[PDB]
Design a protein around this ligand. Structure first.
Ligand SMILES: *CCc1nc(CC*)nc(N(C)CC(=O)O)n1
Lengths: 30, 207
């Protein structure tokens, strides 16, 4: 499982501003 | 820099291979080597520049049940790499529908900004129009279909330049376009929109 912090996530919302689901995991299932 | 494809003739056609801050879009049918090239690139990007890589991690968004981690191990092992480390440096997310695909990009962006040590340097989308073409049917739905696809494409270009990553996507019949076709047995030919011939092998894609 590959998780991401709410701080990093809210920065990405600013990036796509002018424009829960399953996320990502490694090819080894983590 | 540029991510090498493993095929010296294909790298020549692309001018040093696929490039960051750009979107390379391959076209063709089942067996032309679109997914085969995508799995190879996911391994290549992990190598240092002398080998044809960028010392980076990869992201694979799958929308057509094409992801095979066994092949990644096969390529990495044959190319002289720890297939256990290669597998750890490939993030994967199966998109279930168009909306999931769009949301996965935010997840990718956030993971990319954190990665900035092996930072993510390649994003693979296979396929790209599958969900869009399977959910929006007819002329009356074409306007919304073209709009969503254009929005996704805009988000993709944004990440490519924002995090200096390379975006490789697949499609069937703004971006750097390539067409793939089958040839002599396992041999495949690539043509830009003049031609290069590569072969699918145990090490992935090569002359
Ligand atoms: C960046 C988009 C986003 N992510 C989160 C979680 C970090 N939360 C928001 N909000 C607007 C807060 C909320 O749920 O009310 N937006």
């Amino acid at each position: 499982k590959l998780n991401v912090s709410c701080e990093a996530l809210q920065k990405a919302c600013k990036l796509f501003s002018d424009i829960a689901f399953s996320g990502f995991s490694t090819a080894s299932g983590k | 820099g540029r991510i090498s494809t493993g095929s010296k003739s294909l790298d020549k056609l692309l001018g040093g291979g696929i490039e960051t801050q750009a979107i390379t879009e391959v076209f063709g049918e089942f067996g032309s080597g679109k997914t085969q090239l995508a799995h190879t690139l996911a391994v290549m990007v992990q190598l240092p520049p002398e080998e044809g890589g960028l010392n980076g991690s990869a992201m694979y968004i799958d929308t057509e049940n094409t992801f095979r981690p066994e092949r990644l191990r096969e390529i990495a092992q044959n190319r002289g790499l720890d297939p256990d480390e290669v597998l750890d440096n490939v993030a994967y997310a199966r998109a279930f529908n168009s909306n999931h695909q769009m949301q996965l990009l935010y997840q990718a962006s956030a993971m990319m900004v954190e990665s900035l040590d092996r930072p993510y340097k390649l994003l693979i989308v296979d396929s790209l129009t599958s969900h869009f073409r399977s959910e929006y049917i007819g002329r009356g739905a074409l306007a919304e279909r073209q709009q969503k696809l254009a929005r996704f494409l805009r988000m993709l270009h944004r990440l490519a330049n924002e995090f200096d990553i390379a975006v490789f996507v697949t499609n069937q019949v703004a971006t750097l376009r390539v067409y793939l076709r089958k040839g002599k047995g396992g041999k495949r030919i690539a043509r830009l929109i003049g031609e290069a011939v590569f072969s699918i092998t145990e090490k992935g894609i090569e002359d």
